[PDB]
Ligand binder design. Sequence first.
Ligand SMILES: Cc1ncc(COP(=O)(O)O)c(CNCCCC(=O)O)c1O
Ligand SMILES: *Cc1c(COP(=O)(O)O)cnc(C)c1O
Lengths: 363, 365
Amino acid sequence: DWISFSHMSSDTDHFPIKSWFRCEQKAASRSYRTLGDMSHPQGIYEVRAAITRLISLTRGVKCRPEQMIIGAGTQVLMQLLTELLPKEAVYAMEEPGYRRMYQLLKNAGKQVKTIMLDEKGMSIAEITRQQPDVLVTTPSHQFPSGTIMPVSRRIQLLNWAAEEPRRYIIEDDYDSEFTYDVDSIPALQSLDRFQNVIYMGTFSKSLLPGLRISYMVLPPELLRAYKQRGYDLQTCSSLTQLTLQEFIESGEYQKHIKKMKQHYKEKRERLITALEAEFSGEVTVKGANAGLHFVTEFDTRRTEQDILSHAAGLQLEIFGMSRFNLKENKRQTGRPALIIGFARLKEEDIQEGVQRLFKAVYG
Amino acid sequence: DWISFSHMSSDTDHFPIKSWFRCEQKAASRSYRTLGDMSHPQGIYEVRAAITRLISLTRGVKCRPEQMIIGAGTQVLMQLLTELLPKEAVYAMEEPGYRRMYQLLKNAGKQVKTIMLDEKGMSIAEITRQQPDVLVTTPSHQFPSGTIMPVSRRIQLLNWAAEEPRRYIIEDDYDSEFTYDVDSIPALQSLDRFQNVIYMGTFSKSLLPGLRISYMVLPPELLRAYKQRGYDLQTCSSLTQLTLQEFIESGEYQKHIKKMKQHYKEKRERLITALEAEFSGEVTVKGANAGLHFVTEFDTRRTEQDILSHAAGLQLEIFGMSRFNLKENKRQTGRPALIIGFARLKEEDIQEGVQRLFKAVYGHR
Ligand SMILES: Cc1ncc(COP(=O)(O)O)c(CNCCCC(=O)O)c1O
Ligand SMILES: *Cc1c(COP(=O)(O)O)cnc(C)c1O
């Protein structure tokens, strides 16, 4: 009975789960003799090669498959990365941003500066002033604000990293697969002429988060630091990797993304239109030109926690922007701001969801 | 025409891949609408409940699913543990042992003591001497010497840990689904009255056709430490989790374990008979009646490296004890003690494998 405006979930109904299992039988019969065993620690080479081709095609990312590392989550690869990067590196994160990564870095004993955003995303002025060593950025659709970083700002960050040795940018290209605006913008890593960027990718938005498949691409110098480790074991089963590779090479991935691009586009249009009507125009929407969510701000007498406590009662799954407040202070000011995810939201349940949303906002 | 005496986990020839895939289907059907969600960070709860019920009756492990953390393999679970334990904790490991885990700890910048064995396992003598803060131990079937630590030694370790704060015992239970003849002695943590043991288990032996599924059971203090972080995400795919749960609860698992046990019971018997037949009083089989490996000591004038070198020339794959040293600096190998691993040993390969081993142990015949 719940309706879900979650940005963390997907509808199982639009994922071709039967194709996936069919690829799995194919991968299994292809590599039956050795499915049993562990893969190369970075992941199967042929599989790393398929991905390499994919992200070069879609994101213009330039690399050799040996630079790629596959892992069971962005957060296992982020941890590893903190061990490849200089021990005394000062990290910098978007504010607001991904609270888990913030917590991960702190718990690793790192200093994390918090960089505020402007209309173009991560503030280059703040970056220069604070002087961190490594930036963590989400250029395709800033998490959670949704700002698509323009190539002008991408170049600004790439010039910053070039100006001094041992500066790195971690490019978190999370939900970069769908675009409802001018066409794609090549990843920072592709615009880079000096190998200062670590490109991170995941299959959680395109596939299903249940499937724990992610990867990252290392500059050569960090790759040699990884290989010098010797003890690392792969975290994705051999069959999972081969199933993904089969899913992609068969073209099913390409079909799935193209179908979904259209599906999300139209569902996003519907949902917004229904927000503007039900709220009479008295709602502010931001970060809606890409990705699987946007941000909505309301004029109401209620606090964010009131709306959230109430929306929970109306059986509406929804999250407050306060969830993404990195630098702490008792400072909720202005309009309550909520993130509106729509991957998990049914076509049929848009009108009801907006009405439930209205009631939770106003009473 | 290679023959391998080097495997300690099965392969796809041994695994009912079809049963697994069919359980995966059913699990997926049952839990369709929830695949679009990411798991609970400790793993799906009802999965944790299933494993817990299982391990309580097979190993005598006493715990609640609330204390269990599921992960994509033992490495990732060990990595996390080092972050839950005191930063400046000193670790200690058995020698001979799992070198990979030695490097993991060393790369994490930890002090690691190396602790020799006697005929009851990890040396309490050496432990009370070298004074570490946390022990890493394989009490059910030592890796790779095969020693089953007796309860008297388990109690000594337990008492040791209880004596000062910030002392813990990691218990690596890795192949305890296979016990031959006499029933097993339960897991060490079944004796753990003061919450000093962290139980680490895996499905790598009893199953692994590549599956990355392990789990660890935490004492409340470390569990609270874990819940304090708030940033951890499950690494084991939700599909793998539900499948295994179905595999277990459908009964398919015990049926598999029952079959494999007899199969490995046969092979160990048939292999030891053959060793005793071609060698006689010249072979000593040291090791327990458990697991997928044992230790052979040879009464020969060849050195370990000689035998290993003649072994590769006869296309027989084996390892001597010296491989399982954790550390090395200015010394080398030893004298005829090899470990035999028979998880992937064809029955047809037994006599020929034993005949090559005989050749390599003298260089004649
Ligand atoms: C900022 C950011 N980057 C990457 C990911 C993908 O993570 P996995 O590869 O799936 O482990 C995510 C995923 N996050 C959803 C959680 C959002 C929340 O509100 O907690 C992410 O956010
Ligand atoms: C196989 C094994 C493990 C478990 O490793 P996984 O990460 O579960 O594959 C742990 N300890 C020892 C000694 C082993 O041989």
